[PDB]
Structure 1
Amino acid sequence: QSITAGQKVISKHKNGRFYQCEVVRLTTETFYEVNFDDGSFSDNLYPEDIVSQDCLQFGPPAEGEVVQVRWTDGQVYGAKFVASHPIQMYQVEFEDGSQLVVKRDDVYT
């Protein structure tokens, strides 16, 4: 059913193909969901991208909180705090020795 470290699994390598992977490590890692004032959203945001208050030091904003967010072009947009998504991530390793931190079962089993 569910995964632990040392386990063989199948997940995508950076070359774009699926390979055997051994999960070397498990980390919980949190993302932020926001409501951009342009009617779009994002839930794959790192806490550091909320520039209006320190969330990496004090925790998520209040829900519905007005917030400033550095988008992936490093430019700062107005949003509105939706939610904080605590996800279990999986660091795997391939035979060439590469390694990627990953989600689902984006590590199939």
Structure 2
Amino acid sequence: QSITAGQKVISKHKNGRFYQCEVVRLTTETFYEVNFDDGSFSDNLYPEDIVSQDCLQFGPPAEGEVVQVRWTDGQVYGAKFVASHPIQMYQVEFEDGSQLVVKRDDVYTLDEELP
């Protein structure tokens, strides 16, 4: 059930197909959740996407605090900080040398059926 570093596993390569790969490191990804001024919700912002303050250096903003965020479209939107949640993830390396940082549910042991 538990996946550890150095373990050979099976996961989807960037080309979309499953291949054996090796977990080279267990990382911790911190995602920010915010409510945009129009009411829409985002649950996967990175600390760096907050452009109204420097979260990478001083931590997440306070609950409900007003912030500006740089969205995936390169634009800046006003919003309110909701919460922060660190997620344990897996950095995997395939035979060709490419790597990906994936979630637990995207990793499989050699003995289990796919998908």
What's the secondary structure of 1:105's corresponding residue?
helix
Shift of 1:105: 2.0
1:9-60 C-alpha deviation (Å, 9 max, x unpaired)? 1111111111111101111121111111122111211101111111010001
Relative to the length of structure 1, the TM-score reads 0.93
Mark the runs of 5 or more structure 1 residues left unpaired by the alignment.
none
Poorly superposed stretches of 4+, deviation over 2 Å: none
- Could you tell me which runs of 5 or more consecutive residues in structure 2 were left unpaired when the two chains were aligned: 110-115
Q: Quick one: distance in 1 between partners of 2:10 and 2:34?
A: 32
Q: CA deviation at 1:77?
A: 0.2
Root-mean-square deviation (Å): 1.1
Q: Secondary structure at the match of 1:24?
A: strand
- TM-score normalized with structure 2 length: 0.89
Which residue is equivalent to 1:83?
A: 83
Q: Distance in 1 between matches of 2:28 and 2:37?
A: 29
Give me the whole-angstrom Cα distance separating, in 1, the residues matched to 2:72 and 2:41. Answer: 13
**Per-residue deviation, residues 38-93 of structure 1 (Å, max 9, x unmatched):** 22111211101111111010001111111110001111001110111101121111
Matches of 1:81 and 1:71 in 2, distance apart? 14
Aligned pairs, how many? 109
